Ligand binder design. Structure first.
Ligand SMILES: Nc1ncnc2c1ncn2[C@@H]1O[C@H](COP(=O)(O)O)[C@@H](O)[C@H]1O
Ligand SMILES: [Zn+2]
Length: 251
């Protein structure tokens, strides 16, 4: 949309309720230096210069995600309000030394957790939670890295405030707060033990970068540690007033 200097990107949004990816474009201006780093990625402040369609950037014939997983229509999406021209947000790049599939899997995983957030909030707990949207962006104006595969990154809204990690994906309980731990326990019980959401982290109860474990270990990226991840959560978990309010089993 905007005529100002920045760079273009193909923007991908996953929508769980129709089970499709929605493909868009946007222009963005990203700062030169990151403002934070974790173990694997760096985060950069970025501003949006508008969201558009992908009609100038045809797909052609090896596509991931596959064509049947892509919505033919993209007129409605969260990006058009949440990343509208002017918005400050965050872009995350992996450090030098992540396949194409994993960017998409991590964004899908976050959208799945966001759904679990809504389901938890429907039980009217004392504190509601929310997982941020997340999106894949192909930075198409940048030079390809080792191959004709473009530069990929993920983007999400800016969290304002003190960022805290509340548990990890392997059993750590890092704060005293109840709601995070009760949420993890909720996802375990109400999924009939088919999955658990951990790596609950963010600002207050606005969360981002969660991790799912499933018993069979498949999908949900490299952080999916299977039954081991699940058992490690169980070992350290102490039920709290929120667990009890949600009528969860003290097993
Ligand atoms: N959405 C966000 N808004 C603001 N800060 C963030 C956000 N996500 C992550 N951070 C911070 O940036 C660091 C690097 O991101 P991560 O790759 O998720 O570890 C985190 O450890 C946080 O301190
Ligand atoms: Zn509990």
């Amino acid at each position: 949309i905007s005529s100002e200097t920045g760079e273009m990107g193909i923007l991908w949004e996953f929508d769980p309720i129709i089970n499709k990816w929605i493909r868009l474009s946007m222009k963005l201006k990203v700062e030169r230096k990151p403002f934070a780093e974790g173990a694997l990625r760096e985060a950069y402040h970025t501003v949006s210069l508008g969201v558009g369609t992908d009609e100038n950037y045809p797909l052609g014939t090896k596509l991931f995600p596959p064509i049947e997983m892509i919505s033919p229509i993209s007129k409605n999406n969260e990006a058009m309000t949440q990343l509208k021209n002017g918005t400050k947000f965050v872009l995350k790049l992996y450090k030098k030394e992540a396949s194409r599939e994993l960017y998409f899997e991590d964004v899908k995983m976050q959208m799945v957790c966001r759904d679990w957030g809504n389901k938890f909030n429907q039980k009217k707990p004392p504190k509601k939670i929310e997982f941020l949207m997340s999106w894949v962006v192909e930075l198409i104006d940048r030079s390809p890295s080792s191959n004709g595969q473009p530069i990929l990154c993920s983007i999400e809204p800016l969290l304002v405030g003190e960022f805290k990690k509340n548990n990890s994906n392997y059993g750590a309980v890092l704060t005293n707060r109840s709601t995070p731990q009760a949420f993890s326990h909720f996802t375990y019980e109400l999924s009939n033990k088919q999955m658990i959401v951990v790596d609950i982290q963010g600002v207050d109860d606005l969360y981002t970068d969660p991790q799912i474990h499933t018993p069979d270990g498949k999908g949900f990226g490299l952080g999916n540690l299977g039954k081991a991840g699940i058992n490690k959560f169980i070992t350290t978990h102490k039920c709290n007033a929120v667990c009890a309010l949600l009528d969860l089993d003290v097993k």
